[PDB]
Design an enzyme around this catalytic site. Structure first.
Site, PDB file in Angstrom:
ATOM      1  N   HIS A  53      -2.140 -44.356 -21.392  1.00  0.00           N
ATOM      2  CA  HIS A  53      -2.231 -43.294 -20.340  1.00  0.00           C
ATOM      3  C   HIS A  53      -2.502 -41.879 -20.879  1.00  0.00           C
ATOM      4  O   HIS A  53      -2.142 -40.841 -20.266  1.00  0.00           O
ATOM      5  CB  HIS A  53      -0.992 -43.291 -19.469  1.00  0.00           C
ATOM      6  CG  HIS A  53      -0.700 -44.612 -18.801  1.00  0.00           C
ATOM      7  ND1 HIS A  53      -0.972 -44.859 -17.463  1.00  0.00           N
ATOM      8  CD2 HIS A  53      -0.131 -45.766 -19.286  1.00  0.00           C
ATOM      9  CE1 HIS A  53      -0.587 -46.107 -17.159  1.00  0.00           C
ATOM     10  NE2 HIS A  53      -0.056 -46.650 -18.250  1.00  0.00           N
ATOM     11  N   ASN A  93       1.982 -47.835 -11.291  1.00  0.00           N
ATOM     12  CA  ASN A  93       0.561 -48.034 -11.493  1.00  0.00           C
ATOM     13  C   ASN A  93      -0.035 -48.259 -10.121  1.00  0.00           C
ATOM     14  O   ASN A  93       0.694 -48.324  -9.105  1.00  0.00           O
ATOM     15  CB  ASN A  93       0.318 -49.264 -12.377  1.00  0.00           C
ATOM     16  CG  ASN A  93       0.499 -48.965 -13.909  1.00  0.00           C
ATOM     17  OD1 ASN A  93       0.621 -47.836 -14.370  1.00  0.00           O
ATOM     18  ND2 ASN A  93       0.368 -50.032 -14.689  1.00  0.00           N
ATOM     19  N   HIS A  97       9.646 -41.298 -17.759  1.00  0.00           N
ATOM     20  CA  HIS A  97      10.179 -42.518 -18.443  1.00  0.00           C
ATOM     21  C   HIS A  97      10.986 -43.211 -17.331  1.00  0.00           C
ATOM     22  O   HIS A  97      11.882 -42.625 -16.703  1.00  0.00           O
ATOM     23  CB  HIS A  97      11.081 -42.075 -19.647  1.00  0.00           C
ATOM     24  CG  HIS A  97      11.803 -43.213 -20.251  1.00  0.00           C
ATOM     25  ND1 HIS A  97      11.180 -44.153 -21.055  1.00  0.00           N
ATOM     26  CD2 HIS A  97      13.073 -43.666 -20.059  1.00  0.00           C
ATOM     27  CE1 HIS A  97      12.045 -45.117 -21.380  1.00  0.00           C
ATOM     28  NE2 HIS A  97      13.210 -44.853 -20.780  1.00  0.00           N
TER      29      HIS A  97
END
Ligand code: HDE
Ligand code: HDE
Ligand code: HDE
Ligand SMILES: [S]
Ligand SMILES: [S]
Ligand SMILES: [S]
Lengths: 726, 726, 308, 83
Positions: B101, B174, B365
């Site tokens: 990414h 995603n 995260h």
């Protein structure tokens, strides 16, 4: 798990003498002490009381005693993010230490000039006696690591960061007026020679090993700063009682464009004072943190370290008028030839909050100058200008080190530099280059001028070929060591002889010892013979005939090079040990404490155990430390009051306390029956200069002790100490 | 002054449509937009107007055009500290990019829930429809570097940092509901296979190479996400027009301690829309920054990206009620079986000021959860928990990455962690450990509870041996790929077949293509035969006889898996190319722009050169771009007004514009003599669906064009395009 | 065994034309191409065939498909050191890219002089036509990141590391004979102006944006190299078909100490050739790796890049 | 990762194994080893899947953890037996 009900966990937020309260972060101990820089760190100061414990991402933690596991005797689970964040931060706490001066202790404070210096410099911080500049000062040793000891024999650093209105100025000095080497290309050679040797990494904090004396014997330019290091200058009593120097000739530039050469000086207002070697060495083991601790306690007590900034000024047309080169950093400028002009006063009056954040991460660099100052071609300063920016890229992790809070200017800073690791500043400027039209060219260049101008270098003429060559004018190595030697008192000379003798005895290869003594014979034959006698070496007839080097511009000596030849004692902030017994004569203690208080001298009350003892009048005396726990090394003088002397007369640690203090030349005062201790240190009934004695502690007794303390040590006693087994 | 006198260097600080103004930093373009996190960054924002240019130490610079040299043709001097600071910062600007990414584009915004969800979660940000939570969202590709192109075929990331009052929650999703692999231990294998191959570092931004397809052919668990990637899902029109998913089952935990399984969804309120492959590939060349540009320009125009957060909720007691394992991240949960419940709305309404400081340095995260959320044992999630904290130690230089401004919580954070590189926070707590008495144990742990409580993990039962073993329940690889395939429209199916075929044509080793075709035969024979035909591969009799995998819980399709089966078009924020001539019919242009304005559709006026042209009635029309400069790839439809058509009728670039748009299935509208262009795209006289045509550009002409735009592309055109040479 | 029976997974270790075989690491493709530097790298080359999969500490792995968990549907255990080492290494694979010239493509070769230059330089590598000096050469763009496209309009770098017997000599050149600016102090201004703009980090690999042309318009010293970049010089067909230049006057110094001023040139023996703009731009989308690929394949085919 | 600069600290000479070490890990700061394997992932066919996993066994086998039984709830709790 909590705080005691009486509140005795928390130090009073008022000035208190050393030992009276636990030490604390500066903002908590002295919350009303402010300056512009201290206030500007408020964005990043973090408290704790009444706040919930969290992860770094702000999540409250319920159980900070356990890892997450599958059953209470099961394996730890990888999904325990609380554990992993806490141990990850712990796992990366350390950053590289400074290559040199890793060991250091620092404090905040302020500076102001006594009068405007606009006739000689346009530097803003020297322009107005009422414009106050915050400072942050770090004092350090040189060779040892961040966890080495303070009272080693070494050169000391003295670095001051001035947060001025026209930018940061760092005056990055040491406590001797010269350095060991002439050209910065040899710095890694010298530093590697003095540092722990590369096979085994020994010795820490010591020049007393073969590679340093090998280098010295082969590079006579080092001998001048070696003389200072082997003198008592190498073992200061306190960072408050040493001189500071800028090491090189810099320039001052005034509004008319005139350049004046300048060397910088700091004069300690608490006076010059050093330990003696046996004391310094044993104190590295009894309290390796003695100077860090004494500095922090002096500030907590209100004994703020004060220094007077001074300038030696030499007109441009007098550059070549001495018998040494002004640009040679192995040469000093004698104050008998060029006096120090008083410039202003610096006071350090607050400790940091977090050592790592403020001391460990501070970055000082002598290329951080401001308009009104400039450099010279001194070839050691020239190379320094490369090093101090370079080294921060590893030590502080990248080129944004000026954003780490202690390093930030309080002056505005704006430019087109961007990015880099852990970039804090978020630039809104549409442009990141100049010239630009898209932001009408801001931020913009500023012409030089009398005040608030851009920086322009003085237009020094340069004429020469590109050469790697030492100036022939730098090729004299012995006259300045001799001038230093001849300016010391006889006891200082003995301590110089003893430092070289002790160091060279630890050099394993004898030919290195011999080669150093041959250098000493080029300085002074008396020094060389005295060192040779201690090493079992006999000078040759040729050595005996070496012609002494010339006087320095006619001087046979200069007393400002001595620590002691001109009295400059100040007892305020010094400390006395008072040896208690279990029935102290309270009238003696009253008189002692009253006289000490009047002069700002502190006391520590010691005994053979901790807890309390009660005086003859019922006064309960809390005990600071045992005789062994706070040895005489840690104090400036020792008093033993009357009372039940039988309680301590046969205590080996009490007797030895007096033997150590006596050997180290400290004043000792004995009242009443404490005079029975005269027998442990062999004082005749008639008495002896340096031992104060009377039937009681009174006006007279305390005045005599305090006069002794103003002279720092009892040098006359030196011949009497050889025989004491201590 | 370098700015022009008319002020045309400065963008208007108000919403403006794409191309009308130069783009600007968000706090300058939209000073009035705020949220709690944007306000908290004000302490590190740096301006520029009216400031002097300085070093980072605050020293004003006089000459930022020259180095310091000995004579104006001489060598540069080491004492030039201003040069060395400036080049040293430049020299260290770059930090490591993200391992995956690395290419991404980000904006600030806010989130609010439609109602309190306290009956199913105690998460504070979801407890009150009035509570507004600032967000920062980064969209990304996966494979390519930070400098790779936006409209590649790849998966897209969609990561949201929620700055809640009880800590940061990062939802790291995603644009497909599953991933390629089952266990985190294989992540480096899969990522190394898709990334540029290690000998020569080719290809960038592409899975169309041998090592990706080798891995896929050998790991059939990948086939589900490969089906998504080979569909038009792999090439979204905008980050505004794709779905987001949280990829795993997580848990919600309510105040009673009840766990509910949850999968997260983002529904794009602009609808679902993808490019076609030839267009996406060509666009990587004509504008490799097209998605980053389209996102930034949408926010500057007020076409704020909006998304609806939704939850699929499964009670704990329904863990095993499906044909697939809820913990298997290669399986989706069909919306026909478990509907998405709407939760709240997120709006992205402000661009950053500095891309590097806020975008490049942001760290997301999925371990960053808050009370009211918890994990499950999904074995890909489980390993993610390790990686996202670890990787920041190199990428962002150490464990203080949460002190980088964009990553800072807005919630309080206090704990006993200290030091690390780049430490900003200066802790005043006398303690750096707990339990402690010396600070009364602050900051203190907090028990769990219904609000503002400490984090405690849900007490899930664990039972089994310590094994490195895949659950047998994960061992089914073909049913979900088949459900996806059967849910697609016939034109979406054709584009899947064309994506496998193109990619496998780029695999140099033919046996790898054969092995992948074998896998396709296990999913669907029609799909496998169609790919094999394009590769010159013939299926064996055994391949022709493979039994298709079972339906998923009785389903033989689920239309929510298709981009287009169920219309959800929205034209606001789309763009039309208007092709001008040197004598445009003004009445046509007034009607076109009036109707486009009314639906919030933008326009770009194009010609054969820059400058202006003048309409029939004297109106001056400003040209935005040339035909070649702003190709049809960059727009959603093309309109040609009447006028002097002869001017552009034999212009290669103008004809090609319409051929490219025609091939890519975009609506095209021709008025009056612009109907002459029908011959270049081979349209019959009676016309065809998807080509709007009339004597003039109104009555129903713009309504017809806008109806075609709401359906995104003209899919019925697909059979006609293979004949056009474009 | 996962390889095909017929051995077609492995390229032949002989020169083959572009597309005929899969490409390969150079020591497997051309094992007998040697020079002093390639041979000196043998101490660090690691192979793979017939070796067991291990940790970095040399421990053999039995199952490289799964994490360790409590039960086969359980949580992953922190004691899985094999998982953590593998994911730790992956998590830290990236290093900062080059500030400029981040996109580049490199190969090994050698250099040899046509005659002794001892009359004008004492550089050992130029002292005898028998002196074979290994080189490693990296060609690059300037502006774009390491993952940006090859056939952009830009200046190209041409950097040669000569491993001489008297030290490394790096000749760090570009494909035009001048630069945009006069004094190093303005390098960060120029590079910031050409690089993606700082608010939004656009555009990648292009000077075609306001800040570059704003700087050029305000600094007419740039106009000479701007002319070169706007010509077809700025879009070469191949790194094999462009010129190189050392950019500056350096000095050669001979044994007598005489200095001669020198500017360096590389002349491509494949001749000079460039794309046209439309083709270059489209090619950044069709094959952003076109120049990296063409260089690798040329060397694999035996069409070795040669420069005088 | 901070002390020794990255994840290739096993390539610092004193830390290197004397046993063979081969795997699909790549790159990182300070990378010394120059891997020639055509593959940097497994399973692969392009290098016949080498280097390969090795079953556990009596000598020269792969590492397998002992199959200890775990049973309990996910707790942050000290065992009473430790008190
Ligand atoms: C060419 C000769 C040369 C060279 C190359 C250097 N040094 Fe330093 N010196 C450096 C290099 C480094 C490596 O940059 C380093 C280490 C870490 C850092 O951030 O900077 C540093 C620290 C340093 C301090 C500590 C400042 C503090 O408390 O943080 C002080 C007081 C001094 N120095 C004083 C000094 C004087 C007084 C005149 C003379 C002479 C010299 N030194 C000689 C010198
Ligand atoms: C074990 C399986 C596994 C592992 C180990 C990882 N990934 Fe990531 N992934 C990491 C590891 C890294 C390497 O830590 C890294 C690299 C840089 C970083 O800070 O984290 C990262 C980035 C990342 C972003 C960019 C966030 C941003 O815009 O800055 C996004 C949106 C996602 N991921 C989404 C994602 C999903 C959606 C469910 C699934 C599944 C996965 N990923 C799989 C996965
Ligand atoms: C003051 C003027 C100035 C300054 C300060 C720089 N540049 Fe460079 N340039 C640097 C700075 C950096 C930042 O050091 C950097 C970035 C990373 C690095 O290690 O070095 C770098 C890379 C670079 C390469 C790639 C070499 C490779 O394949 O790794 C090539 C071929 C060139 N340059 C060519 C070049 C020429 C031919 C004349 C001229 C002139 C210049 N440049 C001008 C110039
Ligand atoms: S110095
Ligand atoms: S996922
Ligand atoms: S150059």
């Amino acid at each position: 798990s909590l705080a005691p009900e009486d509140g005795s966990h928390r130090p009073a937020a008022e000035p208190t003498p050393p030992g009276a309260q636990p030490t604390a972060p500066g903002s908590l101990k002295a919350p009303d002490t402010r300056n512009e820089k201290l206030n500007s760190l408020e964005d990043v100061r973090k408290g704790s009381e009444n706040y919930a414990l969290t992860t770094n991402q702000g999540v409250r933690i319920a159980d900070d005693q356990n890892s997450l596991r599958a059953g209470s005797r099961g394996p730890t689970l990888l999904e325990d993010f609380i554990l992993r964040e806490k141990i990850t931060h712990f796992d990366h706490e350390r950053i590289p230490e400074r290559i040199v001066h890793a060991r250091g202790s620092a404090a905040h404070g302020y500076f102001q000039p006594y009068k405007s210096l606009s006739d000689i410099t346009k530097a803003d911080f020297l322009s107005d006696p009422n414009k106050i500049t915050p400072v942050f000062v770090r004092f350090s040793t040189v060779q040892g690591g961040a966890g080495s000891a303070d009272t080693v024999r070494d050169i000391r650093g003295f670095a001051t960061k001035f947060y001025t209105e026209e930018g940061i100025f760092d005056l990055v000095g040491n406590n001797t007026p010269i350095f060991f080497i002439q050209d910065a290309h040899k710095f890694p050679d010298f530093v590697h020679a003095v540092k722990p040797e590369p096979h085994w990494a020994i010795p820490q904090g010591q020049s007393a090993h073969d590679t340093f004396w090998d280098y010295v014997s082969l590079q006579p330019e080092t001998l001048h700063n070696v003389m200072w290091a082997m003198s008592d200058r190498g073992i200061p009593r306190s960072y408050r009682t040493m001189e500071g120097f800028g090491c090189h000739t810099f320039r001052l530039i005034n509004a008319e464009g005139k350049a004046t050469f300048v060397r910088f000086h700091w004069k300690p207002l608490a006076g010059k004072a050093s330990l003696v070697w046996d004391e310094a060495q044993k104190l590295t083991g009894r309290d390796p943190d003695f100077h860090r601790r004494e500095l922090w306690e002096a500030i907590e007590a209100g004994d703020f370290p004060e220094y007077e900034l001074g300038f030696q000024l030499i007109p441009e047309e007098d550059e070549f008028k001495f018998d040494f080169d002004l640009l040679d950093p192995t040469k000093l400028i004698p104050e008998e030839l060029v006096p120090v002009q008083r410039v202003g006063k610096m006071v350090l009056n607050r400790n940091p909050d977090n050592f790592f954040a403020e001391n460990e991460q501070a970055a000082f660099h002598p290329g951080h100058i401001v308009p009104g100052l400039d450099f010279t071609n001194d070839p050691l300063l020239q190379g320094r200008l490369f090093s101090y920016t370079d080294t921060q890229i590893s030590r502080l992790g990248g080129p944004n080190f000026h954003e780490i809070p202690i390093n930030r200017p309080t002056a505005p800073y704006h430019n087109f530099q961007r990015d880099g690791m852990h970039r804090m500043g978020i630039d809104t400027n549409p442009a990141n280059y100049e010239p630009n039209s898209i932001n009408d060219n801001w931020p913009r260049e500023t012409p030089p001028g009398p005040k608030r101008g851009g920086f322009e270098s003085y237009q020094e003429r340069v004429e020469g070929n590109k050469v790697r060559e030492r100036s022939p004018s730098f090729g004299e190595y012995y006259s300045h060591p001799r001038l230093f030697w001849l300016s010391q008192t006889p006891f200082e000379q003995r301590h110089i002889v003893d430092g070289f003798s002790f160091e060279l005895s630890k050099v394993v290869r004898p030919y290195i010892r011999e080669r150093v003594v041959d250098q000493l014979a080029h300085i002074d034959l008396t020094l060389a013979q005295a060192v040779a006698k201690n090493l079992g070496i006999e000078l040759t007839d040729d050595q005996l005939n070496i012609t002494p080097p010339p006087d320095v511009n006619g001087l046979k000596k200069d007393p400002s090079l001595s620590l002691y030849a001109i009295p400059d004692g100040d007892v305020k902030g010094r400390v006395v040990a008072i040896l208690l017994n279990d029935e102290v004569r309270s009238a003696d203690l009253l008189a002692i404490l009253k006289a000490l208080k009047a002069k700002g001298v502190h006391a520590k009350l010691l005994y053979s155990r901790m807890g309390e003892v009660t005086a003859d009048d019922g006064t309960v005396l809390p005990i600071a430390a045992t005789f062994a726990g706070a040895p005489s090394l840690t104090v400036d003088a020792v008093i033993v009051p009357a009372g039940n002397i039988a309680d301590i007369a046969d205590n080996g640690d009490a007797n030895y306390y007096l033997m150590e203090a006596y050997k180290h030349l400290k004043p000792i005062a004995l009242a009443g029956d404490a005079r029975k201790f005269k027998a442990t240190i062999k004082i005749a009934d008639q008495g002896e200069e340096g031992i104060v004695e009377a039937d009681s502690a009174d006006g007279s007794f305390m005045d005599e002790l305090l006069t002794l303390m103003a002279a720092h040590r009892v040098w006359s006693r030196i011949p009497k100490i050889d025989k004491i087994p201590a």
